[PDB]
Amino acid sequence: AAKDVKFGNDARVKMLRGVNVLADAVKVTLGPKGRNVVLDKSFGAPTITKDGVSVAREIELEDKFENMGAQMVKEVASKANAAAGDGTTTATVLAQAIITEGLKAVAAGMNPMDLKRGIDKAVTAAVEELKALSVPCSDSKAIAQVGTISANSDETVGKLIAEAMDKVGKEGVITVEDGTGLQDELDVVEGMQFDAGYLSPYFINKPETGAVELESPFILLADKKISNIREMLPVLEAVAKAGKPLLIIAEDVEGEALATLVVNTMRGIVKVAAVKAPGFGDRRKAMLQDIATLTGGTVISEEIGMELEKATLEDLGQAKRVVINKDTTTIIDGVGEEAAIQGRVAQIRQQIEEATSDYDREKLQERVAKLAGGVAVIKVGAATEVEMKEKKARVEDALHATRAAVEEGVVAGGGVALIRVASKLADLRGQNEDQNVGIKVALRAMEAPLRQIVLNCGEEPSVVANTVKGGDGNYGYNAATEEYGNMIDMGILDPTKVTRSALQYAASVAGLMITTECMVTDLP
Amino acid sequence: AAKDVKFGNDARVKMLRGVNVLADAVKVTLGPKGRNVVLDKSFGAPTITKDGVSVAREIELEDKFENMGAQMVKEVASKANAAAGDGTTTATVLAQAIITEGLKAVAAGMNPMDLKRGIDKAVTAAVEELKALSVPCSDSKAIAQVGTISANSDETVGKLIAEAMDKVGKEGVITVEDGTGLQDELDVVEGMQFDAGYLSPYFINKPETGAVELESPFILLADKKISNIREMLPVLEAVAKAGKPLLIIAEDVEGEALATLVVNTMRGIVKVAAVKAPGFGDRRKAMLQDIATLTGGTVISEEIGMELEKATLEDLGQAKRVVINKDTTTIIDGVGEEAAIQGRVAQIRQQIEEATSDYDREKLQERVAKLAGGVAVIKVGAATEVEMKEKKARVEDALHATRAAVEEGVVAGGGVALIRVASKLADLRGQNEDQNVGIKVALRAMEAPLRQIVLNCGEEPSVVANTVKGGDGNYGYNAATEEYGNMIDMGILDPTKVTRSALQYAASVAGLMITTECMVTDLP
Amino acid sequence: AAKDVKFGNDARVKMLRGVNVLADAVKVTLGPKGRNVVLDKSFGAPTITKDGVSVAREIELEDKFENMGAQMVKEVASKANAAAGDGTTTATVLAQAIITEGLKAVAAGMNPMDLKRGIDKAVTAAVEELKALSVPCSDSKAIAQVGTISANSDETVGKLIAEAMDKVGKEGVITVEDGTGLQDELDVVEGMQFDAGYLSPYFINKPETGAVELESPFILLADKKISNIREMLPVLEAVAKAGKPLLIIAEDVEGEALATLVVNTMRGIVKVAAVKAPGFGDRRKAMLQDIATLTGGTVISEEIGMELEKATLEDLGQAKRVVINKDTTTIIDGVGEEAAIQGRVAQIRQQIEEATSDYDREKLQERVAKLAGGVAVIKVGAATEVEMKEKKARVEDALHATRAAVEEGVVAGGGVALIRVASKLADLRGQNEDQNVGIKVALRAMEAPLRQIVLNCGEEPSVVANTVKGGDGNYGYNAATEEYGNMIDMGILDPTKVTRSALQYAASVAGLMITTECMVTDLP
Ligand SMILES: Nc1ncnc2c1ncn2[C@@H]1O[C@H](COP(=O)(O)OP(=O)(O)O)[C@@H](O)[C@H]1O
Ligand SMILES: Nc1ncnc2c1ncn2[C@@H]1O[C@H](COP(=O)(O)OP(=O)(O)O)[C@@H](O)[C@H]1O
Ligand SMILES: Nc1ncnc2c1ncn2[C@@H]1O[C@H](COP(=O)(O)OP(=O)(O)O)[C@@H](O)[C@H]1O
Ligand SMILES: [Ca+2]
Ligand SMILES: [Ca+2]
Numbered sequence A, B, C: 001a002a003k004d005v006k007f008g009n010d011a012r013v014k015m016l017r018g019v020n021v022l023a024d025a026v027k028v029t030l031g032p033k034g035r036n037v038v039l040d041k042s043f044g045a046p047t048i049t050k051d052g053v054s055v056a057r058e059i060e061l062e063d064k065f066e067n068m069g070a071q072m073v074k075e076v077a078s079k080a081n082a083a084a085g086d087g088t089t090t091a092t093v094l095a096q097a098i099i100t101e102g103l104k105a106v107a108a109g110m111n112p113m114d115l116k117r118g119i120d121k122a123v124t125a126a127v128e129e130l131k132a133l134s135v136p137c138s139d140s141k142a143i144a145q146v147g148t149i150s151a152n153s154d155e156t157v158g159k160l161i162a163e164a165m166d167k168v169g170k171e172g173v174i175t176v177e178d179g180t181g182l183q184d185e186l187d188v189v190e191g192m193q194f195d196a197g198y199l200s201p202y203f204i205n206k207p208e209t210g211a212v213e214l215e216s217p218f219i220l221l222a223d224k225k226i227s228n229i230r231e232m233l234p235v236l237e238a239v240a241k242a243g244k245p246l247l248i249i250a251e252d253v254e255g256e257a258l259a260t261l262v263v264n265t266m267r268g269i270v271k272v273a274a275v276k277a278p279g280f281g282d283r284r285k286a287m288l289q290d291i292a293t294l295t296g297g298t299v300i301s302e303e304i305g306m307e308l309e310k311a312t313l314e315d316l317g318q319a320k321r322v323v324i325n326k327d328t329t330t331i332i333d334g335v336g337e338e339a340a341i342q343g344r345v346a347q348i349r350q351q352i353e354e355a356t357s358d359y360d361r362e363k364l365q366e367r368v369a370k371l372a373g374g375v376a377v378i379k380v381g382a383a384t385e386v387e388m389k390e391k392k393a394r395v396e397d398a399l400h401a402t403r404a405a406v407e408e409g410v411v412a413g414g415g416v417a418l419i420r421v422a423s424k425l426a427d428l429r430g431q432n433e434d435q436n437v438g439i440k441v442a443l444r445a446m447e448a449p450l451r452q453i454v455l456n457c458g459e460e461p462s463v464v465a466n467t468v469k470g471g472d473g474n475y476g477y478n479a480a481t482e483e484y485g486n487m488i489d490m491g492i493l494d495p496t497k498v499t500r501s502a503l504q505y506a507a508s509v510a511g512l513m514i515t516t517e518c519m520v521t522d523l524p
């Protein structure tokens, strides 16, 4: 098809306008004081939301050049949220800030490449500054505070996550579920999570999460060298009449006929998923039986002579809920007797101190953490079905952010961290003036989140920013209470990974737009 | 699809317009002097109504932003109606008033978050104030009055609800059914209601109200806990032959049993439902025999050596209609013989005289109230199928609003209650001027129903409002006779629940629109 | 879908326009001198008609608001003719006069509710004046005149009806069906009519009369409600194999039974129809037996231990024809033995001497009336197909108007009665000035029919109206002969009910339009 082709400022103005539409709609929702955005549906009542992610999903523009701008920022901002578990709105605000000033500098005739170079140097520096400024998240009070902030000021979610980690540890495995109702519930059941992905896509159920999920699955374990689908048929008939889904764990899955396992489940007849066994040699086999003892079943080894059609249903292990993934498999509520589990845990212990090299000492210590660790299950309570499912969503978001906070620590929220990092960079320079201006563009933009938060409050951004800047450290503005104080003392905490990622991704896409001379799209 | 995106004032003006169209159409129908609205239909003659529910249901606007505003207020007014059984028009009027004055303040530069805070603070105060002002609805004269108001102004439906309660008690069981015609008839049959619900949610044949409806079902009463589906078969077969659905009331239904029955129920092979028998020990036993006597069935007791397999079709009780929701089971028109039910009642009244414990005595009297209480069935009237089906949702709503009047009491009608409460709130203040303005916005809005009622009379609303304010308590304006008097004495009563539900729901949507900065919809 | 919403005077002009189109098209056909209306067909030559009903049927307007106005008046005017046997054109002419003046008064700023009250008050008074002005219709002469007038000066029709009543009595049961030959025929047969409608609308054979037609069918009589199809199987199979339709008369038909019968009737297969047994208690049982005695059939009761599966073809009664309306059911030519009927009549007449209640006396005498009275059948020959249906439809209208003449009496035709009544009300007043204007609106409207009748004659309405006014009593203008004289003497008679119903219905719809603030319809 023939193309519409724009260059230079003509192209760049278009991009900026589309970015301005996306950002202006997303950014009004920033903060505890964020405004509502009404999102139409083709039927019934409109959706009213303060959630920036929801607002961003909906944005598509008629003008194809403007729309290219909006989509570029959208993709980048969502990458951030996927990496750190939060910060979509903050990233979008940043992108708009850098993009606006950067383009201003381009139009003034400054070197675009130099502007991009300077923005990058500021960001590289800003990221280091954040690492230094960062502080560990350890005590459960701080952890609760992080969750609460990610749950949009809901002290219950943060209280739930902190309670979960208080059971299975901050590094422990945690899964969220729908409860019977009316109050949050917490139970630590038997189960484990190991790293394996599903061997082929299309296995995904509930595609929004992009992870496969089953309910009360049968579990199969083998060496997997085997042959292929044709031989293993006999076990497939028994399950079909249960009926129960099957999760096959094996050294790998090679077979094409084995790859015809994925297809027929697409037809909906029987729901199944296959996943590899982690590691090689005696290490993976010991872990195969590790899973067998947990799920109350025996592994099938073509070495020992055991054949897959020789394996009865009761012989195959079983669990309650299982969630596999691209990088991960998780077993919830394994039906294996606690006598088999604890009996083996003491054995893993025995091998520890007989083992000499510290590499065997560790990995082995990893398996004992899985069997003896279990899986924390958060059952979300509420008054209603729809009022519940929302909260299950907010708990899942707060969880990843808290995980983030555990890894890289926390910083002053409310955009205080970025504002402090900017002051620390005041003396930063590049190789020439253009790069210098690029650095200043990035530093000015670091003020955007706080100002937008303040703006959504109905307060003067210049006034709060000026007052905050006149203070030091963790001194900042609490937008909920309209008070200045110590942000950490007040419980307003961003995971450092989130703040970092938001800046990096925004600077990425901004660098590209600033460096764009040409756009090509179809004819309207 | 590409979207149309509007911000701030430009957006809010559109919302206000849509609200204005919706509310201006709906509010002319408020109160005894309400004007007619003609509603078109694709085929045949138009409909003419004073009922705001019918008018609002029909409103959809061409401009997509305007339409969003209207749908927003609509959703909120219908929720009010679903909660209190009435108040749709009042809710809509309050909504337009709060929104109108709030948006004025926003465009005058005031803080929307503070405006919303003031509104919320004022409504909260008003809700307590209403609860204090509330007075009990007990005597038959008052119930008929509340029914007539909820009618509206139909002494037939109003009276009819009174005998219904007068016969079965104000706490009694009253149900609305289609009826043959051409009048509405009230029948009292043998039936009761106890607290039990579907052991599985999958048994629901009516998703809207979320309940199980079995027509002319057989009823199985067994003491044993049901686990294996095998022992059920001899009875399950005989039930499939008869062509009637089955209801299972037992100690419990679990394991293979609960799993099996719900499996086939989803399929076409069976229509059935099961519930847990209420109570424990001898009471659970005594209650099962209660239900047995009502339905003409025999309790199957594994204690005596009675087995499920031996249980025949005659052993099952029968009823015309049974309704199982989440929290309760309702058995309508049991087949049991009066001589037996009367004897069963006589037996229990004996035990009451023999009762040493006040607790044991209260529990027994609850058993007779259910057995001797019966169930009130209202079969809806008129002629054609269009009104007849529509009328049923009316009387149901009227009955609901009447129950709510008995539970939460009554306040002066004709918008007088809101007027009074707004006077008690004259000294109420917020944190800042903008919250004060919000409080005043809400307090003026509370005058809107009475003013609108009067305006529909062709009378000056400011004179009537001012004259009512000058009086105290229940002094108000009777819009039927165009004369002042005592609202309670003149029989003009609102369920307190309706009034507060309308205020709360209206202030909800108003706060949302006042805090909306962005709207997203499809292209024109 | 999105709607077009109009308010106030803007809406009411549109409504007025559509009313003016309808009424101006229809009113030219009023009276003996009515003009021609040409009605186009999609092919060939146009259709020419003096029939006001045919003209109204065609009117649909492009502007949806205007069209709403026209359809509102058609529907109501159509109702007068359904409850009377005439008056549709009179009602339309009346509606337009009231609507026009009323709407003009509203636009002038007068209180619409007050105007409606004044109109209603005048109509109530006029209805009373009509009642006092009314005179009995007794002798065969006046009965024939009433039928003649409603048949459009056809003396054959009034003569035929009067012969029907001369046999079976003025309150007797009469039915008109297709004439076999060129000449009409009248036969009195044993049969009855009672009030039962079709339980479902979904079975009616002929769309124009909206009634069920069953030829030589079976009649089922059951003392129980039938909730299950399985009890009707043995009898239902017998009937389908006999090549005869089935009429079901029971305590009720509901559940799977009714839904199924609207299946195997509506869809195809054999024709069947069901009606409720009139009344309740023992009167329902007594009445069921009455039908059984008349139809030569046996009542099936659970009370004696009878069962429907045991019911053979011999237990069912039968007749030659059964016509089931919405309101009524008519059995024509019962198969029962006269010795059985006369013995049943005697037993009922015996219970009358034993009756201790005056209510019991009256209800017993209407059963002896149905049994002993029988039915008068009218078969009307036109000499050709198209003329027979047309004439037969005139006889059906005249018959209905004659019953109305019998019940409420007759008054002076040519719109003389309304003029006379309007001159008696000249001093009638109201609560205030607006009501007074409302009364005058009604009184002026009362002259519209006479004036239109004269205008259609081509004389001056003003002159003739004034001459009639200046006379007294039954003095009026004969529009056929163009001479004045006594309207009763000249044979021009309107059943009081027709004049009444015409005025009342016209004033009803006019009251609604005068009180309308809003109209909702589809986008253009
Ligand atoms: N009480 C508060 N005062 C100031 N800032 C707050 C407060 N609560 C939350 N925030 C800030 O709001 C930001 C997150 O807002 P949010 O609307 O969730 O956007 P994102 O999608 O970027 O997480 C964080 O920077 C957080 O510190
Ligand atoms: N005689 C009366 N005088 C004044 N107000 C009345 C009278 N009768 C009913 N009302 C009031 O009219 C309102 C109900 O109007 P309605 O059209 O039903 O609106 P809604 O849908 O909000 O119930 C109630 O507040 C009720 O008290
Ligand atoms: N010879 C007559 N002279 C004067 N008026 C007549 C004569 N015959 C019939 N009418 C009048 O014509 C009117 C009947 O109008 P018609 O054309 O049948 O419309 P509709 O019956 O639907 O009102 C009656 O008021 C009747 O009195
Ligand atoms: Ca739409
Ligand atoms: Ca249409």
Ligand SMILES: [Ca+2]
Pocket: C041, C042, C043
């Ligand atoms: Ca043509």
Ligand SMILES: [Ca+2]
Pocket: C128, C129, C132
């Ligand atoms: Ca009189």
Ligand SMILES: [K+]
Pocket: A029, A030, A031, A032, A034, A050, A051, A052, A152
């Ligand atoms: K937010």
Ligand SMILES: [K+]
Pocket: B029, B030, B031, B034, B050, B051, B052, B152
């Ligand atoms: K109303």
Ligand SMILES: [K+]
Pocket: C029, C030, C031, C032, C034, C050, C051, C052
């Ligand atoms: K005519």
Ligand SMILES: [Mg+2]
Pocket: A086, A087, A149, A150
């Ligand atoms: Mg967040």
Ligand SMILES: [Mg+2]
Pocket: B086, B087, B149, B150, B151, B152
């Ligand atoms: Mg109401």
Ligand SMILES: [Mg+2]
Pocket: C085, C086, C087, C149, C150
């Ligand atoms: Mg006529």
